[PDB]
Design a protein around this ligand. Structure first.
Ligand SMILES: N#Cc1cc(Cl)cc(Oc2c(Br)ccc(CNC(=O)c3[nH]c(N)nc3Cl)c2F)c1
Ligand SMILES: [Mg+2]
Ligand SMILES: [Mg+2]
Ligand SMILES: [Mg+2]
Lengths: 406, 557
């Protein structure tokens, strides 16, 4: 039987426009879909279906074969009650504590489970043609599709049967499903960990399922990117002014940060290049501040009922800083990504940050991206390798928010 | 007596919860009733409509207007509000610059498109209408549609869709032939010798005829050039249909809008067309018949456009075995022009870009946006991005992108020395300037009165304060910086607590909507060295606390 699916009350299905595709990707999509149609996974639809979700073609990480990526962001928002509330997959706190976590793509599992007839219409998508020559080619899904958060929700019961022997024989390995992927964490030595991952691949294989980051993730390695303060044999007015500014903003996050003593040095209307010797009082104020910034922030906790936000700053020289929070200045996590153009590097950072978020909270953040919307939308697929897509919006923060995180 | 297609029907629904229409029929004149009786009789013989009775409770009003020829008009407004949404037919229109040249091309327009496609049987009941009795005395004569009606919300989509399915087997049969579908027209191109092409057109017509779709025979088909959507399509070139720029001593807003529209349309193949000055005349409250005297600039721009247009220009068709090359030139304040060719200098098309993104900007940012606009347009028209030639040095672009806080990426491009070149007109120092005066600046505006003060104190003991009326906090912070710039020598350090002012100036603007920002830019260019730094307000920071007290007097606390 199929599991019936409902929409958010008074929500209609998605009507999202297809962003334009290059010829190469159109041709790739036509080949993929022709084959999926023959296998019965999708069917052509008539004009009495008014819905649309965008599609793209990408390359997975090492591979050179094209893969279809459906952008089900809107459909996912409109079916949140189904996949979050009705059939929620609980997220294990223990995953992030494991020495190694391996990410395995299990998206093929879904194509063997039929999709509820009355829901199929909301999965419509279009392969466009060049120059609006021919009308685009229109299809819907007959089977649980990849990228819809409803799919692992429904396949949950089957995934449990598949994984039962392995979990029973390996009680300290943590396996978490998020969208089309499995996250498998152990504290084993890496040889044994990889050995166990190959065992797991064999289980999945009996159920008809073949198979910016290294091979594995190591989330016990991840650790705070502190706000750091400069250290100098001498200090100018300009230098102190800079430090007062940087501490002023750090005080909104960290309590106890003090600037009175440093500000007492700057009294008068001084030349910016004038050297100012630090008094003992100012020295210890800076020492206390420096100590505060090493330790974490009291009072900041994840709230499962709120969305995660991610801000990213371009720092130059292929370096990018980021912060994840839910209320502003209540940073849950800060990091840095390093080391090929800005858009490529930015898509790498976004995927790395999303993956960490999945591991830590079982949720993707909404990104605030420092880039022209049009540039992003043109280029992001050229470098995207994940099978999910986070929410994003576009910002321009010209401030010294950059200067403050590194 | 035209065919109705034996194609399968598309199933159609009312929007959830809604029932069909029940709009009362208003009494009609005898003349109109008689016209309608004979139109309907004839349509019934052809199978287009069928008679029903008062068992069907639905109704849509009917009308007739006249010439000797009478026409039936059905007002489907109410049915349309109650009918499901469909997929939209055209998500855009083909651009000629995108077409690949064919030896032979034929246009086939389908005769009575809609009336030859059958309507879903379960839906027909909702299309019921009533020819009333003379003086509404007895019951009317009631009919329903069997085919796609004119003016009903689903007809366009269900027709294109039907035509798509019907063409499919012919396409597999004839993969070398191109067939574009636009509204009622089939546009058919081949590289066959002209006899074998005329034959294939005949096969297509017969295939279409076998599906109940009639088309014109060879004697009745349009010959080239083809006039189509404001374009001329010839065998080896294309252009826009001729542009008559009317002469006139007097210009109404209506005339100017119509002119601007024509020039905008001409700009896709006539390079260098400008409309900026003509558009400046349209901003403001303006009735369509109000005469607007052309300013000197608008006359100059018009004369320049007339020159570009006096000799006809045509574009070439696309050759997919070759790169696209796009060139961009700066034309003036905020105006950019571009050409795309494959072989220099035989343009496939041209265009213009002139968009203010944000209140303050520079030529490097504008060129990037222009590149981004051309890139998207190329993906739509040709399925690939072009290689660019740009009037900016590689070193200028490098400096800008590596220092700027936003991610930016122009695809493959080369520098071309076609002045004016794009550059940055000043830069800010990364370090404080030894031997230069340090100005601490601030501004304060009163929210109630709108009065404000702007001023500075300097490390050399100078101070000034100017008073301003009907201002805002933002304005006073920029006025303060402007002051420090006028009163300083060629090197100066400036300290502000305005993140707003800093952010604007750090992006190295060369143009702005603000008169005041332009005056700052003007000053910044004349300096040799400027260092600009920010400090937080109200922390008792040396020089800042004192300019603060100065400008706050009589304004705030
Ligand atoms: N009316 C019309 C019309 C509109 C469009 Cl957008 C296309 C169209 O058909 C064409 C097709 Br199909 C393919 C290429 C071109 C460009 N023109 C030619 O190749 C061409 N060849 C010849 N012998 N005449 C013409 Cl015109 C085509 F023009 C015809
Ligand atoms: Mg201030
Ligand atoms: Mg102020
Ligand atoms: Mg102040």
């Amino acid at each position: 039987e199929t599991v019936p699916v409902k929409l958010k009350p008074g929500m209609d299905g998605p009507k999202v426009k297809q962003w334009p595709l290059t010829e190469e990707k159109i041709k790739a999509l036509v080949e993929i879909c022709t084959e999926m149609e023959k296998e019965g996974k999708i069917s052509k639809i008539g004009p009495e279906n008014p819905y649309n979700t965008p599609v793209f073609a990408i390359k997975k990480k090492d591979s050179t074969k094209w893969r279809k990526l459906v952008d089900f962001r809107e459909l996912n928002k409109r079916t949140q009650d189904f996949w979050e509330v009705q059939l929620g997959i609980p997220h294990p706190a223990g995953l992030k504590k494991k020495k190694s976590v391996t990410v395995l793509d299990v998206g093929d599992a879904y194509f063997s489970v039929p999709l509820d007839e009355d829901f199929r219409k909301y999965t419509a998508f279009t392969i466009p043609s060049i120059n609006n020559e021919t009308p685009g080619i229109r299809y819907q899904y007959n089977v649980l599709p990849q990228g819809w958060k409803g799919s692992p929700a429904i396949f949950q019961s089957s995934m449990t049967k598949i994984l039962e022997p392995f979990r029973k024989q390996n009680p300290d390995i943590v396996i978490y499903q998020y969208m089309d992927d499995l996250y498998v964490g152990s504290d084993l030595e890496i040889g044994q960990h990889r050995t166990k991952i190959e065992e797991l691949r064999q289980h999945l294989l009996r159920w008809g399922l073949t198979t910016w980051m290294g091979y594995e993730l190591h989330p016990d390695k991840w650790t705070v990117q502190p706000i750091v303060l400069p250290e100098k044999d001498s200090w100018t007015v300009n230098d102190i002014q800079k430090l007062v500014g940087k501490l002023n903003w750090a005080s909104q996050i960290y309590p106890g940060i003090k600037v009175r003593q440093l500000c007492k040095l700057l009294r008068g209307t001084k030349a910016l290049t004038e050297v100012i010797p630090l008094t003992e009082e100012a020295e210890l104020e800076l020492a206390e501040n420096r100590e505060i910034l090493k330790e974490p922030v009291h009072g900041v906790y994840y709230d499962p009922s709120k969305d995660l936000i991610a801000e990213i700053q371009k720092q130059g020289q292929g370096q990018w800083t980021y912060q994840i929070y839910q209320e502003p200045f209540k940073n849950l996590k800060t990091g840095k990504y390093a080391r090929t153009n800005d858009v490529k590097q930015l898509t790498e950072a976004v995927q790395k940050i999303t993956t960490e978020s999945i591991v830590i909270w079982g949720k993707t953040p909404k990104f605030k991206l420092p880039i022209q919307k049009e540039t992003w939308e043109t280029w992001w697929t050229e470098y995207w390798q994940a099978t999910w897509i986070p929410e994003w919006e576009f910002v321009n923060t010209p401030p010294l928010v950059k200067l403050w995180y590194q | 007596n035209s065919p109705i297609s034996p194609i399968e029907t598309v199933p159609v629904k009312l929007k959830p919860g809604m029932d069909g229409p029940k709009v009362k029929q208003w009494p009609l004149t005898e003349e109109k009733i008689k016209a309608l009786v004979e139109i309907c009789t004839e349509m019934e013989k052809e199978g287009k409509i069928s008679k029903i009775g008062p068992e069907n409770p639905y109704n849509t009003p009917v009308f007739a207007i006249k010439s000797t020829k009478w026409r039936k008009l059905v007002d489907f407004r109410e049915l349309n509000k109650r009918t499901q949404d469909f997929w939209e037919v055209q998500l855009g229109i083909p651009h000629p610059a995108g077409l690949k040249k064919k030896k032979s091309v034929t246009v086939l327009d389908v005769g009575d498109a809609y009336f030859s496609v059958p309507l879903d049987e379960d839906f027909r009941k909702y299309t019921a209408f009533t020819i009333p009795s003379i003086n509404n005395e007895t019951p009317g004569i009631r009919y329903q549609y069997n085919v796609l009606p004119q003016g009903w919300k689903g007809s366009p989509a269900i027709f294109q869709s039907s035509m798509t399915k019907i063409l499919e087997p012919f396409r597999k049969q004839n993969p070398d032939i191109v067939i574009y579908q636009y509204m009622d027209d089939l546009l058919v191109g081949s590289d066959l010798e002209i006899g074998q092409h005329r034959t294939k057109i005949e096969e297509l017509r017969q295939h279409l005829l076998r599906w109940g779709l009639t088309t014109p025979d060879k004697k009745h088909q349009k010959e080239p050039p083809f006039l189509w959507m404001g374009y001329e399509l010839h065998p080896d070139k294309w252009t826009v249909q001729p542009i008559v720029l009317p002469e006139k001593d007097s210009w109404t807003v209506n005339d100017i809008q119509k002119l601007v529209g024509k020039l905008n349309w001409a700009s896709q193949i006539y390079p260098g067309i400008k409309v900026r000055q003509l558009c400046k005349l349209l901003r403001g409250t303006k009735a369509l018949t109000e005469v607007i005297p052309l300013t000197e600039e608008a006359e100059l721009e018009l004369a320049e456009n007339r020159e570009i247009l006096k000799e006809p220009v045509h574009g070439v068709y696309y050759d997919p075995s070759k790169d696209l090359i796009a060139e961009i030139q700066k034309q003036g304040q905020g105006q950019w022009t571009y050409q795309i060719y494959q072989e220099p200098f035989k343009n496939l098309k041209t265009g213009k870009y002139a968009r203010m993104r944000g209140a303050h900007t520079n030529d490097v940012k504008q060129l990037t946006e222009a590149v981004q606009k051309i890139t998207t347009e190329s993906i739509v028209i040709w399925g690939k991005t072009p290689k660019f030639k740009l009037p900016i040095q590689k070193e200028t672009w490098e400096t800008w992108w590596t220092e700027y806080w936003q991610a930016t990426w122009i695809p493959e491009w080369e520098f071309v020395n076609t002045p004016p070149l794009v550059k940055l007109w000043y830069q800010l120092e990364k370090e404080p300037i030894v031997g230069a005066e340090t100005f601490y600046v601030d501004g304060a505006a009163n929210r109630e009165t709108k009065l404000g003060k702007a001023g500075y104190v300097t490390n050399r003991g100078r101070q000034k304060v100017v008073t301003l009326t009907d201002t805002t906090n933002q304005k006073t912070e920029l006025q303060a910086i402007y002051l420090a710039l006028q009163d300083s020598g060629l090197e100066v350090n400036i300290v502000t607590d305005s993140q707003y002012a800093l952010g604007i100036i750090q992006a190295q603007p060369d143009q702005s909507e603000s008169e005041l920002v332009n005056q700052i830019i003007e000053q910044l260019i004349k300096k040799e060295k400027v260092y600009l730094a920010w400090v937080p307000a109200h922390k008792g920071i040396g020089g800042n606390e004192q300019v603060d007290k100065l400008v706050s007097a009589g304004i705030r606390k």
